[PDB]
């Protein structure tokens, strides 16, 4: 199928220099204490879209209605939220009306990450759906410069066999191989472009976080062979020490 | 070797009485919001000499003592849990010789020892066998399910890449129970003393769970004969039926 693609956060420097890894955008933070007051009424609404949308805007007319915004504690938007619940339909729909994919919440993870982290509801085929909306979200980095494959590594290698987390990795791996056949349809920019396995294996497989850890390095410490092996297979370098001076190979892996 | 016991957390009567399954203790509601940060602080340090890092995180928080009984995630689960999780066989040791009490079960009435057949971390690791001379205990304990270690054994067996684990997770158990029997005591037990194979043939093999499912009648219903027939050589019965009139032998099984 095609990949229903969206442009308004997708811009500036993140989609046309040399495609590299950066930091999440910090959570927004809006005055207009009015923008927030039409979109908490937005949001109690949801719990057709359009139709959501049309009252609200008559309703508040004077502001514009900004998705853009904290909602909770910890950070999240209002993306974060529909993400951790797997509601792609409105996920699809926030994204389509303003939803920047490229903030982070308070410790600087993407929606993505939010994803990956709520094992309880996601399906391996809900999970690559996903990724057709928030495939942006793969070249972010959080506040302990830990990617996207730090997070799968982490929370595969910390739940067990009934959540669908020991699946991601390689579902991502081959969405990036099947995209490349794919057309794209507005609701290619510089990520769905660039971001091939020559990308991977160059920007993120041996990534280091602020601790100097591989996601492989993380891997060879919790204990499960099956996600040592797979990183070895995709190319994992297990010579990468972190900042404890210890490796891969110091684990047996490799 | 010896079994090095502890009963800090092994003083309840229904302990004393005849051994019978008992449910997890209930996830503790901390109150204190300062001690779960100071443990949420000390635990990230672990996964990231035991004594040393124990006298670091004390003067990091000077102001709030050290608890180790503290739910420390989402979904109820103590540190004993997550160390398990991921068979950190040495982390669980000092954390049990500290004070961490065993019997806890998260949100789910799942203890730490359910953990360890809930992932593979133990069977790649080998560490099973000799986990179970701390967390034996565990092994009279049923959830909100009342599913005993036994039934949470067979569901994870019917996970993809799990089937080996189980086998192992079960045969190490049965032999655990019979060769404990010549194993010197030393305190580094009304239970370790009343767990033996008959008990475990009279209360656990056949137990039920809350649909009338014995760990066989699900084995039976997932189609993996290996464990299969391993759980009808040890015994169990494929005559006894759920809350569906629904037997194991009505599954081939037996």
């Known amino acids: 199928g095609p ?7 997708l811009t500036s420097d993140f989609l046309s ?9 910090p959570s ?26 049309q009252e609200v805007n008559d309703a508040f007319p ?7 915004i904290p909602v909770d504690e910890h950070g999240n938007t209002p993306l974060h939220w ?14 389509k009306h303003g939803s920047n994919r490229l903030y982070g919440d308070n410790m600087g993870e993407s929606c993505l990450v939010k994803a990956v982290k ?25 506040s302990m410069n830990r990617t996207i494959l730090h997070h799968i590594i982490i929370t595969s290698g910390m739940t067990g066999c009934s959540a669908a987390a020991k699946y ?8 990036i191989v099947k995209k490349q056949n794919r057309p794209i349809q507005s609701g290619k920019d510089s990520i769905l472009e660039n971001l091939d396995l020559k990308w991977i294996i160059a920007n993120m497989l041996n990534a280091q976080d602020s601790n100097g850890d591989t996601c492989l390095n993380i891997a060879a410490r ?33």
């Not at 999970?127 to 070249?139: K, N």
């Open 28 to 53: 927004p933070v809006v005055n207009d204490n009015e923008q927030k007051m039409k979109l908490e009424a937005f949001l109690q609404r949801l719990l057709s879209f359009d139709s959501l949308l």
């Open 222 to 254: 919790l204990g499960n062979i099956s996600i040592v092996d797979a990183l070895l297979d995709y190319g994992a370098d297990p010579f990468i020490a972190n900042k404890s001076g210890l490796r891969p190979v110091d684990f047996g892996a490799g």
């Open 3 to 9: 990949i229903i693609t969206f442009t308004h956060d």
């Open 168 to 175: 991601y990795l390689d579902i991502l791996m081959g969405w």
């Open 62 to 68: 004077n502001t514009q209605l900004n998705l853009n």
């Open 118 to 142: 709520s094992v309880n509801n996601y399906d391996s085929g809900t999970f690559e759906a996903l990724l057709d909306y928030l495939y942006p979200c793969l070249i972010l980095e959080d």
């Open 82 to 95: 529909l993400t951790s619940i797997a509601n792609l339909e409105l996920v699809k729909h926030l994204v």
């Open 17 to 25: 220099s040399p495609l590299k890894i950066m930091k999440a955008l």
